[PDB]
Write a structure and sequence with these properties.
monomer, about 270 residues, alpha/beta, 2 domains, 10 helices, 11 strands, about 40% helix, globular, binds phosphite ion, signal, periplasm, PhnD, Probable ABC transporter phosphite binding protein PhnD1
């Protein structure tokens, strides 16, 4: 249906959170743009990229890696916006309390994760896989050093927390904002977990739009869409509700140039391929 603006997102958290966030976002866009807007869930990160490529999705909340992948597969698409935090984004490594492992204050301490059961997030996660693996490798830790000579891939930051919290895995890595959200608002999910390490900064999440929206929605639509997202205003109750779900005071401009380092890291780890 070409007259519906279809919103998507990488499934980086439990579906209940995603539904609430993206349905509220969609309703606000629909009011301001005077068009039908619908959030369309997907099963995994690959499905977000491929749904964008096939034009089943028009406007998608991507991670750094998955947004790079999507824009490579889908030429002439548009980087729309990000949060302030997405310019200086971080991961956390977490460990199960039962290990009695002390936190570290230097990257070389990641060697303490060798011979443990370790899970990443999605195979295509920036904060849950790509950057954690990069940092592990800098410490001399490779996937083959983990218990079983393999790592888990949980598919989402909430799922990583749940796996380490249950003792299915000893350790994992995830989005630092998600870790903090769970720690405060869902403390039972984090009862058996301790913060192990906070990573250096890198670029992450961003909105990506199709390049052809004008043909369906009229001249100037993409500009209007970008404007609506950038002008979301913490002082307005309905905007606040949306913005709080993104753990942000505002959205800001983002350009394709800024994802060069993620792309290069992706190439080095053979992760540009889905
Ligand atoms: O790509 P995102 O899960 O940090």
């Amino acid at each position: 249906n070409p007259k519906v603006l279809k919103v998507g997102a990488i499934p980086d958290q439990n579906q209940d959170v995603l539904d609430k966030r993206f349905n509220l976002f969609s309703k606000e866009l629909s009011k301001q743009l005077d068009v039908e807007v619908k959030y369309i869930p997907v099963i995994n990160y690959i499905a977000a990229v491929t749904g964008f490529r096939t034009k089943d999705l028009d406007l998608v909340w991507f991670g750094g890696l998955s947004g790079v992948q999507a824009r490579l597969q889908t030429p002439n698409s548009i980087v729309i916006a990000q949060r302030d935090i997405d310019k200086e984004f971080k991961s956390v490594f977490v460990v199960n309390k039962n290990l009695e492992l002390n936190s570290i204050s230097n990257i070389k301490g990641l060697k303490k994760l060798k011979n443990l059961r370790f899970t990443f997030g999605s195979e295509n996660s920036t904060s849950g896989r790509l950057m954690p693996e990069y940092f592990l490798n800098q410490a001399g830790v490779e996937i083959k050093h983990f218990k079983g000579k393999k790592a888990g891939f949980s598919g989402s930051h909430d799922a990583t927390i749940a796996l380490v919290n249950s003792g299915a895995f000893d350790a994992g890595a995830l989005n630092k904002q998600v870790w903090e959200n769970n720690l405060k608002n869902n403390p039972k999910r984090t009862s058996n977990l301790e913060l192990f390490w906070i990573t250096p900064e890198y670029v992450d999440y961003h909105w990506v739009a199709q390049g052809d929206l004008e043909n369906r929605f009229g001249e100037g639509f993409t500009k209007e869409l970008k404007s609506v997202i950038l002008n979301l205003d913490i002082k307005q109750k309905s905007h606040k509700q949306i913005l709080d779900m993104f753990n942000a005071k505002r959205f800001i401009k983002a350009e394709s140039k800024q994802y060069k380092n993620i792309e290069e890291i992706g190439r080095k780890l053979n992760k540009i391929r889905l």
